Amino acid sequence: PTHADSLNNLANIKREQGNIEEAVRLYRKALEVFPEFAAAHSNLASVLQQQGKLQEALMHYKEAIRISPTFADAYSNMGNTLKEMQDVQGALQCYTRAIQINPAFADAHSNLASIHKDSGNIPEAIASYRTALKLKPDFPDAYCNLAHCLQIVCDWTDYDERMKKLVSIVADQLEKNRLPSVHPHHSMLYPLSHGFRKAIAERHGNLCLDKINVLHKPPYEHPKDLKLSDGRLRVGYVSSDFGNHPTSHLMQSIPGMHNPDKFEVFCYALSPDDGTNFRVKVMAEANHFIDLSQIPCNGKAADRIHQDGIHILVNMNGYTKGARNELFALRPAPIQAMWLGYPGTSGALFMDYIITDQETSPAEVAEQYSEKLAYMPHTFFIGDHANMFPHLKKKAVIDIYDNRIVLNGIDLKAFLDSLPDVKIVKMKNMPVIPMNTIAEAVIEMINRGQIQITINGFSISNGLATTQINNKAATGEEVPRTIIVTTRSQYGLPEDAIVYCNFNQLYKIDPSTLQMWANILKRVPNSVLWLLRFPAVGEPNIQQYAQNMGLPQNRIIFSPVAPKEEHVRRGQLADVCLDTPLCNGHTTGMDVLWAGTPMVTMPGETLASRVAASQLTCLGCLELIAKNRQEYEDIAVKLGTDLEYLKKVRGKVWKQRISSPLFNTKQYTMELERLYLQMWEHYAAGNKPDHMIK
């Protein structure tokens, strides 16, 4: 049993180091010498859990507990395993049982907090992280995770001190080569240096390298020419987000727009089929669709990618939920590039390129990234809005304002032509329906909360009732087949004032940003800021910090999160979008621009803080991009007071969303194609990854 104990401690150190195979070997040998050894069962279970052997893991956790019924550790680690298997009920039973055994067990409190957060119970998560910290004040994981909860609800009590402490915690962890407690995806939210952000990522990349080294795969041998593929570049899009996810809402038309003479497209799904048209469309239009969710072993899954012959393997997850970067760590393809889904560097040497653009990622900051920059010529951002919401390409109003009462629809022109007295208005072409028996009936439907009515045989629908009329149109899976009415009164917005919006999750907002917004609102009397309950419990924090800034309550109007098509349709009711500088609207930025709504942004240094400025540059609206906070406020105030200048900027957005590259998925695909071929030349000529700043 001291022989056993030294095997176990060695195993623990081998584990901290990342030598997983060897750790396992030793735990087993520990049990081989001392079978009734609870901690070895639990630690073995715990490393098997790292390896994805969830069942075998559970079996050893239960041995541990059988041997020692009060072993709180085993219960807490078993909870994480159950959580990994999506058995939330089982995880909660384990965590609470561990806390019942030892109410001072801080890890157990921290893990209970984490499942509360994931369930969208932030107040309880915060409370349980606080208990963790109370019990163990030096607890990085729990602190940083608390910091993210607070961020999420816009709690900024002791904000600057908190930021300083996150940085310090990360500094320390990076000095000790331990896994930082700030997740790489969250790292743009805090005043970490680009070196810290790059290193955070590098460390999570290293996790993946450690996990694949147990498999002992030799390097794969990679194609040097297009001979086996009949002259076609084989491109593999790897994503867990081929389904109802923002990623598919951005890029679902790209696969089938690829040029099959010169490209052969393979989609590697990491998630199972969710039943949505998004999945249906990519499965139908990619040349080959492979479901790697059915292939849990990453060895065998990388094998497949290699035997499909991929030249460029594309990482659409980075560090997001569903990632299997282990696939990329095995390098089954000679060229591996980050694209679209992850707004950061991977920090990993197994990724060769990040696809991006000059505005998003200027040369100055190329040391922000482990990868070489592969520049698209306009923005790297793209959106499938032209295909998903073509009923928003045109609009009509009722009585002259462009954004109080709005009608959209595929058959809108025909309905207009059915009416006696429609006027057309030249934009600085917008149909206008005069105040009329018909106009009265439409407004009446809205006020009374009616779902739809009929006028001249046309179906006219209440934009608030999309899920009752057609739930697939609500999600963006189908184009609506009725005419939709959308109005400021449906959202409690005033008919007579400037509406600034921002429809992002509240976490992207920070004190400086809300201070800007307040300044702007103060400068523009009778205007409002229109935000979302995302989540709803951030609302009072926001409202309060705004009261402290001088603003009355009625100046900020919260609406609920809506189905995808309503969200997009409703941005039409706003005058201006005030983008979040800390982390811009990305998908959200394309959403609001498709409504014809100008966006004021202030590009920062991070990739996430520059994306909207790149969208806007591609859109051709340089006037909306601020160089500092005074600019940002002046632009926004100007757009709220100089109303002719507001007409002009809105007309420019409205038409540039069609005539500019921004929402042009075909053009984007073709440009993407040129860039892939550049990447391929360079490597086929025997060179290594290098910058492609066209």
Binding site: H185, H245, T320, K321, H567
Partner: peptide, 7 residues
Amino acid sequence: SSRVTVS
């Protein structure tokens, strides 16, 4: 309800 980018 509505799907987003997450870690």
